[PDB]
Each structure stands twice: as C-alpha cells, then as structure tokens.
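Example with several molecule types.
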Amino acid sequence: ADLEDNMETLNDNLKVIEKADNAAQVKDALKKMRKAALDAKKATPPKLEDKSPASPEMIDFRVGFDELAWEIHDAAHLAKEGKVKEAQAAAEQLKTTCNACHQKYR
Amino acid sequence: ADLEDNMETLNDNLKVIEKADNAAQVKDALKKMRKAALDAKKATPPKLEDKSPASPEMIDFRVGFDELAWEIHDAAHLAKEGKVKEAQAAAEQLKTTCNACHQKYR
Amino acid sequence: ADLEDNMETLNDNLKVIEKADNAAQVKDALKKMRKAALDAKKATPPKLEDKSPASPEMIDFRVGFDELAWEIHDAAHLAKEGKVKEAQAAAEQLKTTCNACHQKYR
Ligand code: HEC
Ligand code: HEC
Ligand code: HEC
Ligand SMILES: [Ca+2]
Ligand SMILES: [Ca+2]
Ligand SMILES: [Ca+2]
Ligand SMILES: [Ca+2]
Ligand SMILES: [Cl-]
Ligand SMILES: [Cl-]
Ligand SMILES: [Cl-]
Ligand SMILES: [Cl-]
Ligand SMILES: [Mn+2]
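Resulting structure tokens for the full complex:
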C-alpha cells in the first residue's frame, strides 16, 4: 500500500498498544506495524522525490524501516513472553525512531 | 519550505486529526499545522506573482495565515485539555478558512 | 492509480499549464489531467466510504470528474487553436471545480 496508508497502520496500532489489555492485542498490533514498516521501504517520500533512487537519503530512509522493524520485533518478544508492561514501554520508545525519520524526511 | 509542501503538511495533518483517537496526536498534528501556516505566510502564491508584493491581495493572503494560526491555536487548547471531540470539531471548522483563501488565491 | 496519485497528477499538470511556453506542452498537460480525472472517477474517497456506492454523494463525486473533464476539454480546444493565453485562462477556472469538490469531500 501507499506510504501514508502504512503510516496510518503504524500510528493506529501504536495507540492500540498504549491502551492494550493482554499480550495478544499487543502482539497482533506489533505484527501489523512490522508489515507496514517493511511495505513502507518500497515508497519514495515526497521530500525525496527528486533524489536519485539509491541516494544516501533514500538509503537512509529505507534502512530507517529496518531499524524500526527490529525495534518492533524486540517489543513483540517482550509481549510474547508475557511482559506486557515492558512491551508497552518498548513500544513507546519506538517514537524516537519515528520522530528521527520525520524530522529529516516528512 | 515551499508553499506546496506547507499546504501538503496542512492537509495531511488535518486528515490525521479527523481520524485521531487521543488528544496527544491531535495536539502534535496541530503544532505541525501552525508551523506550516506561518512558513506559508512567507510565500508568494502563483496567482499573485504579477501584483505588488504589498498589494491588498498579498496582505489579504498573509493575514489569512495569521487567522489560520490563531484558529489552530484555539483547537490546540482544546486538545491540551484532553477534549478530543471538541478539538476535532474546531479543527474541522478550519476548513472554512482553508476554503475562503482557496476561493480567492488557489 | 489510487485517488491521491491521480490528484498529484492533476496538481502537477495544472502547474505545468500555469507556466507553459508552447501549445504542445499545454495540450500534453491537459490530456494527462483528463486521464487522471477519469481514473479518479473509479475511486471511493475516504470521506464517502461510509455512503452507499451510488449514494447521491458518490454520484456528485463521480460527476464532478465529468465536469472537470469537460472543462479540461474546453481548455484543450483553446490550446489546439493557438489561443494559449485563453487556454491558461481556462485552466485557471478549473480551480473552482477542484475547490468545490474538496470543500465537500476532501
Ligand atoms: C522514515 C524512515 C519513517 C519512519 C521510521 C516513520 N515514518 Fe511516519 N512518515 C514518514 C514520511 C516520509 C511521512 C510523510 C508521508 C507523506 O506522503 O506525506 C510520514 C507520515 C506519517 C504520518 C502521517 C500519515 C498521513 O496520513 O498523512 C503518521 C501518522 C506517521 N508518519 C506516524 C509514524 C509512526 C507512529 C512511526 C513509528 C512507529 C513512523 N511514522 C515512522 C517517514 C517515516
Ligand atoms: C491562503 C491564505 C490559504 C490558506 C488559509 C490555506 N491555503 Fe491551501 N493553498 C493556498 C494556495 C495559494 C494554494 C496554491 C499553491 C500551492 O501550494 O499549490 C494552496 C494549495 C493547497 C493544496 C494543494 C497544494 C499543493 O500541494 O501544491 C492543498 C492540499 C491545500 N492548499 C490545503 C489546505 C488546507 C487543508 C488548508 C487549511 C488547513 C489550507 N490549504 C489553507 C492558500 C491557502
Ligand atoms: C471531486 C470531484 C474532486 C475534484 C474535481 C478534484 N479533487 Fe482533488 N481530491 C479529492 C478528494 C476526495 C481528495 C482526498 C483524497 C484523500 O485520499 O484524502 C483530493 C485530494 C487532492 C490532493 C491531495 C492533498 C493531500 O493528500 O495532501 C490534491 C493535491 C488535489 N486533490 C488537487 C486537485 C486539483 C488540482 C484538482 C483540479 C484540477 C482537483 N484536486 C480536483 C476530490 C476531488
Ligand atoms: Ca492518504
Ligand atoms: Ca503526503
Ligand atoms: Ca495525503
Ligand atoms: Ca498513493
Ligand atoms: Cl507586509
Ligand atoms: Cl504581518
Ligand atoms: Cl498552538
Ligand atoms: Cl482539505
Ligand atoms: Mn494560548
């Protein structure tokens, strides 16, 4: 899907994790985030439309989602062993990676 | 940033507000809107390129962003109080200011 | 193409028209606008996903692209007969149809 759609998937499930009840809600929301972050790697963001497709900015953009997907996965590990509160805290820390990419390319 | 990017920022965050679930998002989206409104005030829109830079039309254009910035601020205050629906109602009334300027200078 | 992609096409080519220097560039810009308008007619905009597929709002949306396509046609005519200044002038009144649909459905 489109880049804005994948971002809405990231944003909406991050809030689900904030409010979540049990590990299953967290784990399901985190798996949807990981799919969206990988799908986002296929996109060219408007601010980099004019750059060459393998420019250092475009590489920085794409690897930002590898970084995000791995941090998502670390939080999902906490949830799958049942450390729901720690999973939620790890998910809140994802905002730093979100915000780092945004201040460059959003 | 260019007028066009500022307008994308305004439209994109308005849509984020319309779908938002908590006050924190609405607040952060409104703050990005206020930045882009003030930055857009520096631009000369294509329709007014051949008029004096201090023409009544250019003053009207620039004051429209003061108005938009203050209206955004009113909605931000509702979001800061946690009143999600009220801040969403106020953000939706922003369209009247968006529309009014477009009718003249789009 | 999805709705937003066709909108970017409409917007980019209207800007090309505003600053064109030959009737062949205009002619080319208008027909990519026509294709994007007709392709956009196939979409359901997010704010009307809640209405029936042939609701009065969905009809109003689709027929808006017919009115767009016919105004684009009038512009392409003026351009094909060398009036160029009148073509750009016709492309400028396109904007009222852009604005009208956005005010209801964006
Ligand atoms: C780069 C590596 C990014 C990472 C990591 C995240 N986001 Fe993002 N985001 C990015 C861009 C380039 C854009 C602009 C897209 C456009 O076409 O305008 C965005 C946008 C958003 C949005 C707005 C979506 C919309 O409908 O307009 C949201 C709500 C958003 N981003 C949230 C978000 C979250 C919660 C992230 C981490 C969990 C995250 N993003 C990561 C670039 C990047
Ligand atoms: C004048 C005082 C304006 C106000 C208030 C708002 N907008 Fe605007 N907009 C204005 C102009 C002169 C233009 C054309 C220049 C341009 O950027 O193309 C626009 C255009 C837009 C667009 C498309 C622009 C693009 O991407 O190139 C959008 C999506 C848009 N405007 C949205 C928008 C919203 C949601 C507003 C209120 C929150 C708003 N604009 C206010 C002038 C003015
Ligand atoms: C209805 C009949 C429309 C007409 C005619 C035009 N547009 Fe449009 N546009 C429409 C909708 C419902 C939407 C929202 C789509 C969404 O998924 O949110 C849009 C959006 C745009 C945008 C994108 C703004 C953004 O996402 O940042 C642009 C730049 C835009 N529209 C421009 C545009 C122009 C230049 C038009 C006339 C030539 C025009 N639109 C007509 C619906 C309709
Ligand atoms: Ca979108
Ligand atoms: Ca965008
Ligand atoms: Ca958008
Ligand atoms: Ca798209
Ligand atoms: Cl001044
Ligand atoms: Cl001033
Ligand atoms: Cl504010
Ligand atoms: Cl809008
Ligand atoms: Mn105040």
